[PDB]
Amino acid sequence: PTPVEEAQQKTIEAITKAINYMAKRRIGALLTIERDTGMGDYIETGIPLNAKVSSELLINIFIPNTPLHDGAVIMKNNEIAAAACYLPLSESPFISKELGTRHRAAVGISEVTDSLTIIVSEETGGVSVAKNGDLHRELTEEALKEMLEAE
Amino acid sequence: PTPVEEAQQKTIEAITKAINYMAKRRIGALLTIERDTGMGDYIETGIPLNAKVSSELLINIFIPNTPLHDGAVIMKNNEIAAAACYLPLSESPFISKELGTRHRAAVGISEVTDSLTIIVSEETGGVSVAKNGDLHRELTEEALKEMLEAE
Numbered sequence: 001p002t003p004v005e006e007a008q009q010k011t012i013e014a015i016t017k018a019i020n021y022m023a024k025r026r027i028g029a030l031l032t033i034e035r036d037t038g039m040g041d042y043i044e045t046g047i048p049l050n051a052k053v054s055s056e057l058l059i060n061i062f063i064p065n066t067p068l069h070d071g072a073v074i075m076k077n078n079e080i081a082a083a084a085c086y087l088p089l090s091e092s093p094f095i096s097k098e099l100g101t102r103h104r105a106a107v108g109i110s111e112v113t114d115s116l117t118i119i120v121s122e123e124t125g126g127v128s129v130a131k132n133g134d135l136h137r138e139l140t141e142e143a144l145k146e147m148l149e150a151e
Numbered sequence: 152p153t154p155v156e157e158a159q160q161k162t163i164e165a166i167t168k169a170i171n172y173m174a175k176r177r178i179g180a181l182l183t184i185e186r187d188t189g190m191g192d193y194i195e196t197g198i199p200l201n202a203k204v205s206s207e208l209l210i211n212i213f214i215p216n217t218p219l220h221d222g223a224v225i226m227k228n229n230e231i232a233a234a235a236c237y238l239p240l241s242e243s244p245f246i247s248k249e250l251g252t253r254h255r256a257a258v259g260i261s262e263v264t265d266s267l268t269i270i271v272s273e274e275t276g277g278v279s280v281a282k283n284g285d286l287h288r289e290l291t292e293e294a295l296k297e298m299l300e301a302e
């Protein structure tokens with residue numbers, strides 16, 4: 001592997017480790033990965049971090065009833081750009097009616113960007129991904145990894 | 152007021168807001184500010200963050216029973232360099248006997264560096280500072296801020 005490939009795989013492993021921990025504990029989480037469409041306007045709504053990715057930091061960010069847990073983490077250029085960011089709520093009538101604002105925010109950003117957003121449900125610990133205006137629900141660990149590698 | 156001076160003031164405000172919040176809630180914390188003696192050897196024992204400082208991130212790091220809460224945060228200028236770092240334990244007999252490992256680690260690093268370390272007791276909420284081998288306990292909010300401004 002090249003340095004850039006090794007770095008991408010390390011980031012994927014850090015994300016999946018954090019997501020698994022949160023899914024097991026039913027910790028709600030919202031993590032958007034910026035792609036070609038710039039998301040600076042949304043990054044600017046949160047708390048700046050520009051931090052190295054680690055599973056530890058991702059977990060610490062989303063702990064319930066803490067300063068950083070409300071809102072989205074946005075990743076950009078292999079770093080955590082900001083936490084507690086605003087994302088736009090989707091008005092799509094085709095999202096499962098049992099899902100709340102975390103999932104609607106993820107679908108919303110996916111409607112206007114090419115980003116990939118991961119959501120952990122605080123109700124069930126279920127893991128989902130929003131891309132292109134669609135929500136892919138009840139993902140296995142393998143499925144999430146496949147989506148991150150495809151992305 | 153140069154940009155350097157304004158950045159320092161912002162960092163002091165972030166630190167003091169976080170410490171005050173953790174003191175009120177008896178959240179144990181151990182926060183070392185590198186000065187002229189480089190602390191790379193200790194930074195490298197922790198989880199790298201290289202993050203912009205915020206009161207929110209400082210608080211999120213020290214929440215009990217989370218990946219990052221045990222060990223020291225080490226700050227370099229206006230960044231959180233790493234969390235969950237090792238510091239050496241002091242054997243000084245002037246550490247109150249009831250105090251635990253955070254205070255002994257803080258005095259320990261203060262014996263071999265010119266750093267300033269802030270400690271919040273999880274037993275009492277009291278705030279202390281270790282510098283040059285001495286521990287100063289039960290600091291008021293005003294005294295801590297004045298110490299940081301002088302540092």
Ligand SMILES: Cn1c(=O)oc2cc(N)ccc21
Binds near residue numbers: 063214216
């Ligand atoms: C480990 N953990 C978790 O899963 O939820 C938490 C909440 C708090 N306040 C502190 C720790 C945890």
Ligand SMILES: [Mg+2]
Binds near residue numbers: 288289
């Ligand atoms: Mg006194």
